[PDB]
Amino acid sequence: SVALAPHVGMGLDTRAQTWMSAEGAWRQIEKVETWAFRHPGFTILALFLAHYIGTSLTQKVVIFILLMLVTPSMT
Amino acid sequence: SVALAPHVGMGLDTRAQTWMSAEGAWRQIEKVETWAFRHPGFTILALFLAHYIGTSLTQKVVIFILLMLVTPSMT
Amino acid sequence: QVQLVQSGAEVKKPGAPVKVSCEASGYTFTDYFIHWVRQAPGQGLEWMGWINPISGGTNYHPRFHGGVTMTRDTSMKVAYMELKRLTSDDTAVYFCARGRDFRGGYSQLDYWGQGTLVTVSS
Amino acid sequence: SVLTQPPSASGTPGQRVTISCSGGSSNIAINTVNWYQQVPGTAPKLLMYSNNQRPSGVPDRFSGSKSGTSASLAISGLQSEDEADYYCATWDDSLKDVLFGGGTKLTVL
Amino acid sequence: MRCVGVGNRDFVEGLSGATWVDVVLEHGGCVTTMAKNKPTLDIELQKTEATQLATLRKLCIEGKITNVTTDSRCPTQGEAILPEEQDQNYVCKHTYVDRGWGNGCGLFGKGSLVTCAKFQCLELIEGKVVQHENLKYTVIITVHTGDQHQVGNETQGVTAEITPQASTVEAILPEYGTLGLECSPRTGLDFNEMILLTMKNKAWMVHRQWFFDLPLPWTSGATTETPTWNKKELLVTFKNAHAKKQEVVVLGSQEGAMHTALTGATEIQTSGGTSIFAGHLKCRLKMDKLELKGMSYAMCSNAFVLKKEVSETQHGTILIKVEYKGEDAPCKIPFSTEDGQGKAHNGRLITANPVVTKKEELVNIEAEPPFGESNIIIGIGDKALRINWYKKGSSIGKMFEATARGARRMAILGDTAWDFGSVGGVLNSLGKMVHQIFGSAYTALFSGVSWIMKIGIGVLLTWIGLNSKNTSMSFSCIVIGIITLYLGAVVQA
Amino acid sequence: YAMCSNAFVLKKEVSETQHGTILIKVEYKGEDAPCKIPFSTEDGQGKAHN
Ligand SMILES: *[C@@H]1O[C@H](CO)[C@@H](O[C@@H]2O[C@H](CO)[C@@H](O[C@@H]3O[C@H](CO)[C@@H](O)[C@H](O)[C@@H]3O)[C@H](O)[C@H]2NC(C)=O)[C@H](O)[C@H]1NC(C)=O
Ligand SMILES: *[C@@H]1O[C@H](CO)[C@@H](O[C@@H]2O[C@H](CO)[C@@H](O[C@@H]3O[C@H](CO)[C@@H](O)[C@H](O)[C@@H]3O)[C@H](O)[C@H]2NC(C)=O)[C@H](O)[C@H]1NC(C)=O
Ligand SMILES: *[C@@H]1O[C@H](CO)[C@@H](O[C@@H]2O[C@H](CO)[C@@H](O)[C@H](O)[C@H]2NC(C)=O)[C@H](O)[C@H]1NC(C)=O
Ligand SMILES: *[C@@H]1O[C@H](CO)[C@@H](O[C@@H]2O[C@H](CO)[C@@H](O)[C@H](O)[C@H]2NC(C)=O)[C@H](O)[C@H]1NC(C)=O
């Protein structure tokens, strides 16, 4: 719907506090955490995918973070 | 609730048509596509980030696709 | 024909709950509000809350929130209302009115009830 | 914000009656005004079922309109039956409640 | 004196050779321009009144269905049309339904079915384009004159209206001459790309492209009853009961989802005139014709008494509220700051010239005493007032907070932040050009990236720079990553 | 003709052509009708006639 495309990142920043800054600052992180907490098994799956696609440790952690971020937000 | 967490991932499913299946099937991909069209520079940024972290073409492609899927969705 | 008829005139002493009722018939009850307006003797009209009988949600006036309760009871098409602790000041006649769901119909009331007058004295 | 209206009166010959409600920028300015007639001792009647729209009867003796923050009920000539208590009601958004006018005792003179 | 205790004021100590000093004015912030001899004054932008808005692209956030009619046909009989399909107020969708014996016709298969339903908007929201001609800026110029009721007063001050047309107004100060401000209102908010959508009594500034992108049924906004809504299928959902039949649903009110959608757009007050409270504009203000009232006044011999206890501003500047006891209606307050257990002059006077206008009223003298112990003297005689005061501060800490404030300004104004106090040096021009090019490239990349994603991308860039052998690329990645960390940590305002 | 000695007033907001060129609509409030319009383009922070 319209709520999935928030007005975040558009270059209209000013000194005045924006509408729902406090809530909308952390709604996305709260969603990701609650999804990663209600579905623990995907942590195991993402660890497996990162281990078998990430040659170096930095690549492994980048892949793991991106997998644990995209899936809650692609729900 | 907020649209950020739709009831699409639960294991419960049946023969009958789910509520707003037709729209919700492609709603997220439509949002990602329209965000990508609106802001094309991040395509260049994601290309650079994938090229400087992915040794193998599989690694570069997976990082690029995950990074282009996260930013429109995590916004 | 659609009309709203009240419970009938009631009298009670201060500090006694009273349950004023409003009968609805002739139309689809769930599709319109009951705006439960109030009018003191020889005073200006004062709206005090409406309920959505399709769901039971209640929008009390800020003054009357907590002091009054309203129940839909859609089985008998009877929009009840109660006063928690009736005081000497709150003597008036309580009309029940029908309003539309949308914004343009929030503040338009047709087919009012006659109004249950409640007298409060010791 | 609370919308207000004064009590008025006019003679039996219907020159003009100007009965006005002046609300805030949240109640009147964005919501349709609704006018109510109350003959004393009787339940109020919906004089206007929308802005400048009549449900039934009494044409050209009851005709309203709102311009900006204020609303009014105009006339082309009153009659003896037009003596009652009038109320303008709008749905406020800031207060999120239905506001009724302070009352007005229009008397045929 | 209007901008005292504002909490976002930042001084402009230096005046140029040609006596014009350039300031960027923000609504929340303040600017107290000083000078060698000109009367100091705190210009502050009140608001940006926008008038004659032209509504366009009304949007439905709710709906209603009323009529719903269905007509279905048999397999290999074609699609099943309705006479209401051609109407411009009906929304409907084709669906296949399995039919056969016991259902209307002999042949077995899947038959077409259509359910068309009228659409009514109920509540709606309208985006209003701001007419750039009618956009108006009002800016107050209060002068530090030491009025008794001026220490934090928001009312006192002479307003100067600024519009894209006739953007240079010489504000007439009461007795300080004319301050000719030459402000540039076309480099402020790019209002050509912002349209003011209004839901009920609330309005917001939203990027116009985003407003056009958000999916909701819309019409021309030509104040016509019963309009036709293009793309009205977004507020109706058609669901199949397995495969037997077809049903329409109005999908409820999208008002809360619209409140969530504009979760980063700054809010406007639409009560009365559509007054916009966010924003900024640049002002090159000329102090050529300012006259210091009291330059010709004499000193005063009689003693001074302070009515209320001395307080400290958030920016460390002391502020004195003192009443004259003499018989001299015009006066010039003597003022010397003595260092601890010694004699010196190391404390500035933030108010340009303190003058007693009347003995009946009392003057508000403001000052910036030096760090540490200090002694401040008001009177000139042997019975002079002694205001002992100690300033908790470190000049290194002041430098750090000044750099922090400058970074905050740079993270918002961007290209024009280099013009906040530009005296006119050639170094500032080069810095502004470099910043403008880099910022254009940066906002080309990071546009539409959320704050958490900005933090992530910046951390990733910093890590890449820390693990890159090529020194040029390492330095570039480190700098861009640090800047991105800062932006993502400050962006969501 | 000579040069105008009186002020000008904008009657329609300036707008930018697709080719970067501005258009200006002014009305001259003065008595010497046949005249010339003085026109100097002061750059930003400098009086360079660019
Ligand atoms: C929340 O705000 C509302 C107003 O927006 C408060 O309603 C107020 O309720 C008191 C109850 O005593 C009213 O006082 C009464 O006023 C009438 C006026 O004729 C007087 O005759 C009575 O003796 C009594 O003093 C008051 O008028 C009313 N305010 C209004 C209608 O504007 C409500 O109490 C607030 N909730 C709280 C404080 O918890
Ligand atoms: C901001 O500035 C305004 C105006 O400069 C201040 O309003 C002023 O308030 C004072 C007292 O509060 C008024 O003084 C009056 O003097 C007469 C003289 O006899 C006395 O009888 C009155 O009782 C009163 O003391 C003064 O007239 C008034 N000026 C106006 C309204 O223009 C205001 O106090 C300042 N501060 C704030 C926070 O607004
Ligand atoms: C759609 O439904 C409305 C009512 O829901 C129909 O309105 C009818 O209008 C006629 C006169 O035009 C009245 O005599 C009927 O009483 C109305 N119906 C009801 C239920 O009150 C309307 O005809 C329907 N069709 C269209 C195309 O609007
Ligand atoms: C399904 O069965 C019902 C009854 O078993 C059928 O209804 C009967 O129809 C015949 C002829 O139309 C009547 O003479 C009977 O009286 C009906 N019985 C009833 C109504 O109980 C019906 O026609 C069958 N087919 C469908 C498609 O419903």
From TrEMBL, chains A, B:
Domain Envelope glycoprotein M flavivirus: 2-74
Annotated localization: Host endoplasmic reticulum membrane; Secreted; Virion membrane
Subunit structure of this chain's protein: Forms heterodimers with envelope protein E in the endoplasmic reticulum and Golgi. Homodimer; in the endoplasmic reticulum and Golgi. Interacts with protein prM. Interacts with non-structural protein 1.
The protein, known as: Genome polyprotein
UniProt source species: Dengue virus type 3 (DENV-3)
Biological classification of the source: Viruses, Riboviria, Orthornavirae, Kitrinoviricota, Flasuviricetes
Residues of the full protein shown: 92 to 166 of 659
UniProtKB/TrEMBL annotation, chain F:
Compartments in which it is found: Host endoplasmic reticulum membrane; Virion membrane
Protein name: Genome polyprotein
Assembly, per entry: Homodimer; in the endoplasmic reticulum and Golgi. Interacts with protein prM. Interacts with non-structural protein 1.
Shown segment, full-protein numbering: 297 to 346 of 493
Species of provenance: Dengue virus type 3
